[PDB]
RNA sequence: UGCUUUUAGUACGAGAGGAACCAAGCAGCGGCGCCACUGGUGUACCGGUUGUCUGACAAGGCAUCGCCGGGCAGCUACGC
């Protein structure tokens, strides 16, 4: 009955003991001491045989954070502190709240009961801190204050005890003052901290010492005594006398909520589906017997055990084995192994009930944005999606001629390094057209290149990737094979935006049972006839064979759909991929034999026809937008708003949360250039901006010819408009 | 330019020198079977097809080889991405010159009856494919079917540096003709 | 850089074609220049064990060839003395491809490396099978 | 103080002198002198060379 | 410092502690939970953390052994028992207690210095028991009797205390008789046993109680009392104060000879080399020395571990990075896993001087029974080869056409079980040529088939296959082309026996320096020119290119070679594989162009010629022999030998030692059928034969005609064959 | 006159990034000297051997020191 094994059983007891769970977390500004605190906490309560941790950064169970000194992303660990003769399972949400994160922040915060704001004892409350704190609070995540790095003040800056507490007081003040401006209603529900109320600790993670007003009294150790030990090299004594884990875990349990309680207000704030719905009541008031709620927030792909998705068991008991679903991607995958997280590793256990992050393997429907469920079509906390493709490309060159090889390999790694780009690695010209998702993303990656690999290279003017689009319903255009033995009367017309969206969603596929697919389309809008006569879907294009009784078309098909996909990949105008285009085949005159129906004859006719049609139907361009979110001060809104408005900023919300004017708008990607700069420049450096693919939109006809010409030139094309006339040759 | 060469020649006539030349011009020689042997017994280092495809060896001297999904790399442009990438995949190579001739078929007549079984048995299946594949590359890969054109090739390379389009054409056509 | 315990004569000068003895695909590399080496008039750049040189891959795979890379010499035929007075010499000269920091591009090093390079760049030591 | 034996003549390497020779296969040989190193590099064997201890052992084998 | 966590520490240095080291074995009968008491010696007796010790019979490195009452193969471990306040390293290397186990048993005993006895109550010195005592006597492995579970005699059969142990007093006397009669000298040399003196114990392994006069006294519970306690029914409580392990261990330390003593003993008899080199000295007179004098007892492995070839460090030292040869070639591999069989596995380490075990890994090409040592192994222990194949198989059938499917799995799979069963599994009619060379081999698999899967099949009679060859140097035969354009003058002749043996060993490799190979050949005897012209080798036949001048020949080599190869697969006389035949191309005459040089012309010519050559060269046939090691009871020799000799068996050694006449005679497989059958009458039912592929010799010329005749019809071939001229049809 | 370690991932900075005084070692070039060590040479010397002459053996002449191998002192640097 090893100490570890007894703890293991304890672990299971606590698992089925929701009242004794504390899914806490750590929230702080860069280089404040996150990783430090974390790991030294683990070792502080000695959950594992001490040595085990430290050297092998545990909390940093991944590989990036493992060389920083401050937490970066998600995962979790566990502590079991004894408080007034009682143990409590303390899950330790890793913190993906580093400024270099958007949705991830949210995701984790929607799995964190409460957190611990860690404020450098010197540098005080910082921008980062502000951002994280306000965010978390918005998503209802009560924190406590652990001012770390006191050691610095005490020794380095040789401050005196009295001053020590004056400074810390001023910090406490700042802390709450912000909390106030964040949410007065929550500041009225007394979440605000104060060390006298035990919700604030004082210590140094790097030295594992830490005190707090309560413990202080309990043990007799006062701020002045602390100062004495510190000045007299007695930080060892400090640590021993008043452990770091001690103070922290006290705040973490005595004043931080458990699954149940947390879940209540959490569901009320984050979730939007009617709380009377079963799933609702289940995850609100602690219930795992109801519809499975397991929003995967991490995919610990165990190299020797497969994809291990780590999500918080908001609802859904984990009895061994369960065929289920998920949010959005609610398909039909199962649930095999469901290990809990002991230390930083995966301890395999059976049934896990409520508020207990579990790692589940054998889960195809399981990634970020997907809340694994056993009730199909599960309601959403915050709506999510899944599509995201390169829209802003740059032509990464290699100035330094003695770098090409290196470059080649560096971007050959960039693929998995950050799965959001699609470099067109070439040798013809040497210009690696890296296609990123955002001008900022691009800039960031490019910078990372000559920094972590340091290839003396740069990137040239970013360009927007558009789509080719038709305007109206066309008139049957004859597509003739060279030998004239085949004629393909075909027309096209805009693809119904509804259908567009759902196809990009992926549900509608060509690998779908007739009935199944057809229905969807039918209601979405596709006229029954067409829905029944579809034969292919490409991005946002379809080739609806609407003809009947044409000999040899059944077989012929392939070659025509080939031409179709070709033309769709590059439209006759701006040579850009076609999007939102649905073709209707109306007649198919064919020669009897296949001799005069070989691909070399079929493919041309189809191609020719489709292109000519597109052009006759006022071919436009689709410009992607990019939903902007500007977390800025209240005050700051004059220049900000005018800026976006001048940049076609369709404001869809402005959330003027007390002292913060968090404007949420939508601005065209092409026009997002420069915005980065101007926003902060004008707003005196006070503008935390963030964006995300706002969906392709029918480019304002205003200067369509202009944009077109630009593209034409850049991609070296002809100056005579590609008149449909020629395409529909004799 | 030629960087790697697949020399699976049934008829070995004069392969030794072509090989020597290529090696002296850096061109790695990725060959297997008879050729491979002669070459390694004539002081020419030659890598084996094993270090390209995932296919070992069996009845070396005719088929034993082929290249699916992957032939599409040399195909009609061993540099055309969509084309290119296919032949080189996992440890595979971007050979830009393949020389595959085919021993002329003959039935003859034995003392106890037409030797149909073995005679027909030796219908090269790998070879011809490699040929047609490479051949299609009117660009990139310079196919060397006929053995009586190693000179021309070598000379051109040694001088110029790149087997001209004209030449590539002639060669390719000739290969297709040979398979015909 | 960190000082070595031994005294190393800079034995290989610019233009030397050295066998490359890792699994990177470079068989023979010619020394172009020596990093952190300032010369004098008429003196060729010189490199002994522990030095990093800019090299050009003359033999090897076609992807490696003609590339300007960094290499670290791990074996040299010119004798060098250890601090305790014993003179050490290898049977040949040998180099391994690395980056600026000293990390080897290869994964295993065939042949013995010098203890001097093994200590100056600890990753070369771990990559090498035996350190002499 | 490492006590080292000459591979050719079998004599103890006096401290502060002598050579260590390493082949490609990692084989290491202590040489007391340039004479021993030269005779080793000539392909001569110590057991056939009479003035060395291995030559003396081979001769006294009879 | 959790049990084995401490052990690890002590062990790492314990390596060079021969004084306390205890590498020993256990020999007796089966069905006496012998391998189970040994499971409990250390794994049972929790030599690691109890959870990770003997819980799931993991002790033995070869996990599969589990427990059947005796060792399965030669698995290894270690146990640091304390005796008179001292932690002796009792490396448990329990030796296989069977008889079939042979050339490998030799080294499976060399791995230890004392095999130990275990005989359950009134089981007695069973035939097998005495057989392993005989095997023990060879490797100078002193034994101690351990009469297991006397419960039978006790509780069940109730034989009064005194009687009870008097029966064993006699059994002990029989073990003395064994160590007298068998080898009289052996006795006094420590091999003597006795309960009184302490060199004999007893006790139920399954109940874990156990005692022996030393134990008995020390514990205060004399055997009489123990009987009373057992009888009563408290054998478990008895076990408690008389730990099954303890007894055994106690004796290994005290009574059972410490390795050091008979460290020499084994070697001389077991080792076939110079027992007086550094290595020899060390292995004998307990010392380290001997340049890594490891012995590949059994090439083993382990998942992501190493080729854990076993070999107790009978001499030398261990370290990570030693270029170690082998007893087959000079592989030279990094020896990373120089660990010690400890806990329930093989604790991998490095620093291990001679004393304990020494299982080295890092290999993948040696043989079970090698002696891998850095030192240039002149004559390592089982300096042997392995080149062999079964040549007298059968035709596994199917009594029921419904079992065929099953049969299919059964047989295709069996390869896994045993790769020595080259299951030439035909596919058409399905006369499954299940491997075999003798009656042994036949039944060997017989049962396996009808037991590890159970099938309703059967067998036919011995497939009397051999190897075709010739015996006379011929005169150049011309092999023309179909199209009468080419020609090849080839001659054929016997392959010299030295050369034969050479390539039978394999050393002569195609992938081998010409110059080098050339010398070897000349060495053997073949003149310079001929020896240099060698092009290729198939099976055990060589093709020599001793021609000069023929243009465009090496561009044909391919074809000609293959031709040769073909013939080598199918004899020209009996249509059987050809071996030990040297073929030499003298001249040739190929057509100028390539058109008239295709396979269809070349291949015939070659085949034709080679074949004819063989015919004319007094083509005979070879026949496998099988060395019959027959351990007939000493006395018995007249009949024993008579049998063999009568069955045309060229008598070899009689091996008369003590009471054991091992008469080998390399009995020709021809008449090597029903050995046991004959034995049971010839030697009044008393003889233990065992066979092994003696090698391919010449079938008695006298009976050639007969042999051929049979073969011809058995396959289904015309009575007469194409006599010379006809096959050489011009 | 550089590199590396330290100061210090600190000041500074929202981050990214990222110093300075002091201290240590090493290196490039230069200067001066030295020869225990290592390398070269070493037409002192020792040996092997080809052709030829002194009748043979032995001992010697000549052929670049005939050539080949080794090399003490001395000088020297590629060494200190």
Curated annotation (Swiss-Prot), chains A, E:
Pfam families: EFG_C, EFG_III, EFG_IV, GTP_EFTU, GTP_EFTU_D2
GO biological process terms held by the UniProt record: translational elongation
Residues in tr-type G domain copies: 19-228
Presence of keyword Protein biosynthesis: yes
UniProt-listed SMART domains: EFG_C, EFG_IV
Cellular component terms (Gene Ontology): cytosol; ribonucleoprotein complex
Binding site for GTP: 28-35, 94-98, 148-151
Transmembrane segments: none
Location in or out of the cell: Cytoplasm
GO MF annotation, one: GTPase activity
Source domain of life: Archaea
PROSITE patterns: G_TR_1 (PS00301), G_TR_2 (PS51722)
Keywords per UniProt: Cytoplasm, Elongation factor, GTP-binding, Nucleotide-binding, Protein biosynthesis
Annotated positions of the Diphthamide modification: 596
Family matches, as HAMAP family: EF_G_EF_2_A
Family membership noted in the UniProt record: Belongs to the TRAFAC class translation factor GTPase superfamily. Classic translation factor GTPase family. EF-G/EF-2 subfamily.
Stated role: Catalyzes the GTP-dependent ribosomal translocation step during translation elongation. During this step, the ribosome changes from the pre-translocational (PRE) to the post-translocational (POST) state as the newly formed A-site-bound peptidyl-tRNA and P-site-bound deacylated tRNA move to the P and E sites, respectively. Catalyzes the coordinated movement of the two tRNA molecules, the mRNA and conformational changes in the ribosome.
Matches recorded under PANTHER family: ELONGATION FACTOR-LIKE GTPASE 1, TRANSLATION ELONGATION FACTOR-RELATED
Listed NCBIfam families: aEF-2, small_GTP
Protein name in UniProt: Elongation factor 2
Organism: Methanosarcina acetivorans (strain ATCC 35395 / DSM 2834 / JCM 12185 / C2A)
Gene that specifies this protein: fusA
UniProtKB/Swiss-Prot annotation, chain C:
Protein name as catalogued: Large ribosomal subunit protein uL14
Entry superkingdom: Archaea
NCBIfam families: PRK08571.1 (NF006344), uL14_arch (TIGR03673)
Function noted in UniProt: Binds to 23S rRNA. Forms part of two intersubunit bridges in the 70S ribosome.
GO molecular function, one term: large ribosomal subunit rRNA binding
Alphabetical keyword list: Ribonucleoprotein, Ribosomal protein, RNA-binding, rRNA-binding
CC annotations in GO: cytosolic large ribosomal subunit
Organism annotation: Methanosarcina acetivorans (strain ATCC 35395 / DSM 2834 / JCM 12185 / C2A)
UniProtKB/Swiss-Prot annotation, chain D:
A UniProt-annotated Pfam family: Ribosomal_L24e
The record's free-text note on cofactor binding: Binds 1 zinc ion per subunit.
Record-level GO cellular component terms: ribonucleoprotein complex; ribosome
NCBIfam families registered for this protein in UniProt: PRK14891.1-1
GO BP terms: translation
Keyword Transcription regulation part of the UniProt annotation: no
Similarity comment text for this entry: Belongs to the eukaryotic ribosomal protein eL24 family.
Positions of Zn(2+) binding: 6, 9, 32, 36
Coiled coil: none
Domain of life: Archaea
Zinc finger annotations (C4-type) as residue ranges: 6-36
Protein name, UniProt field: Large ribosomal subunit protein eL24
UniProt keyword Transcription regulation present: no
GO molecular function: rRNA binding; structural constituent of ribosome; zinc ion binding
Assembly information from the UniProt record: Part of the 50S ribosomal subunit. Forms a cluster with proteins L3 and L14.
Native source species: Methanosarcina acetivorans (strain ATCC 35395 / DSM 2834 / JCM 12185 / C2A)
Main function: Binds to the 23S rRNA.
Entry-linked CDD domains: Ribosomal_L24e_L24
Cofactors required: Zn(2+)
Keyword list, A-Z: Metal-binding, Ribonucleoprotein, Ribosomal protein, RNA-binding, rRNA-binding, Zinc, Zinc-finger
SUPFAM superfamilies xref list: Glucocorticoid receptor-like (DNA-binding domain)
InterPro entries in alphabetical order: L24e/L24_sf, Ribosomal_eL24-rel_arc, Ribosomal_eL24-rel_N, Ribosomal_eL24_CS, TRASH_dom
Gene3D superfamilies to which the protein is assigned, alphabetical: Ribosomal protein L24e
